[PDB]
Design a binder for this molecule. Sequence first.
Ligand code: E2M
Ligand code: E2M
Lengths: 182, 182
Amino acid sequence: GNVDLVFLFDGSMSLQPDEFQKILDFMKDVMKKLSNTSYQFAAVQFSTSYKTEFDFSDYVKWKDPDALLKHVKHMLLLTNTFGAINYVATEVFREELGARPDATKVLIIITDGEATDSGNIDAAKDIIRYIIGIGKHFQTKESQETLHKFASKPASEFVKILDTFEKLKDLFTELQKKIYVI
Amino acid sequence: GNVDLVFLFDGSMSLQPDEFQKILDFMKDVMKKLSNTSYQFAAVQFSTSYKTEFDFSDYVKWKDPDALLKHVKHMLLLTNTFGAINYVATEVFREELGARPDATKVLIIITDGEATDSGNIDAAKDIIRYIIGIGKHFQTKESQETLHKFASKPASEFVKILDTFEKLKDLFTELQKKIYVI
Ligand SMILES: O=C(/C=C/c1ccc(Sc2ccccc2OC[C@H]2CC[C@@H](C(=O)O)CC2)c(C(F)(F)F)c1C(F)(F)F)N1CCOCC1
Ligand SMILES: O=C(/C=C/c1ccc(Sc2ccccc2OC[C@H]2CC[C@@H](C(=O)O)CC2)c(C(F)(F)F)c1C(F)(F)F)N1CCOCC1
């Protein structure tokens, strides 16, 4: 039925300007494609700290991804993935910020680095979690494995390793082939 | 996996010019929303006779509903629904027209009247059939019932009756809420 979806995007220092924008363009592509549906969106940038760039209430008032993401500034710091998953779950998935109690919860994590913090993601056990690991930092099997503990299972379904930020376009192509009425 | 979908739309004399236009506009609204997906479309006008206005191969090459339908002329005759469905099954879902033999076949039938011919639609048994009945001709339970034999079962899932042609907007709104990735 209803799907409240949060994009949790990396704003670490490793990300070049163009790579950071390709993340934004990807999220905007998706949101545009799925306007006027049972989907509701929010977005949070995570580096060292966390910022709700816009929440569910904001999406419903605007329904305009371009406008909604126009204040994003690249944090340019670390990659605190654990703290960021917990921040989404405790501070973003809230009825007080437009979330629908009924809805299927989905989290899309987009990163170019291994996490710099630690802990657990117990607060997010009730959320379907996908993670996109992009670039050279994820060349090895071991690097790719570290990303599993953040995502739902199996990794074959919920973990996607992309070789470049151009490949975000290919992923948008792939997903659209999975868009169906019903 | 792939979905091959035909719009089989009514061009009977009973349709006023604006009503005919609104069917054309509904079809374009749907296709535009499902662009760049696993859906490929064909459109076929039926009254007394039948015409393929564009085929699947036209859609793949142009991906432009506006242009693909720009040359439709309202037939202004009868409503031979039986022969029309039969024309779709045997003449439209063909490699020659860009049909993928392995795909899921969908037929959307849009009509404002009861069928003027008879016979059977046994040739369309492999096709998932939806029928939209529009207007005052479908005021009675009885008249809406006459459409059941053309649609997949049950009628509650595959038959929709609309009071007016303006209500095509409302069906467009409803259907988009049923759009999902997966
Ligand atoms: O809405 C979704 C998921 C959407 C979704 C999922 C992943 C993703 S991205 C993703 C991340 C990790 C692995 C795969 C992924 O997608 C592969 C494609 C093709 C395969 C599909 C599948 O595994 O069924 C997924 C898409 C997205 C995204 F990113 F587009 F935004 C989206 C988004 F675009 F929609 F948001 N549902 C419904 C609830 O159940 C889960 C799927
Ligand atoms: O692609 C489709 C059907 C789409 C489709 C279906 C009906 C319809 S129109 C329709 C006609 C008769 C009854 C209902 C109908 O829609 C209810 C909505 C909401 C309920 C949904 C559901 O019961 O799953 C269907 C849509 C359409 C249409 F018209 F938009 F073009 C479309 C179209 F827009 F997509 F083409 N699939 C996926 C494969 O399995 C069959 C359904």
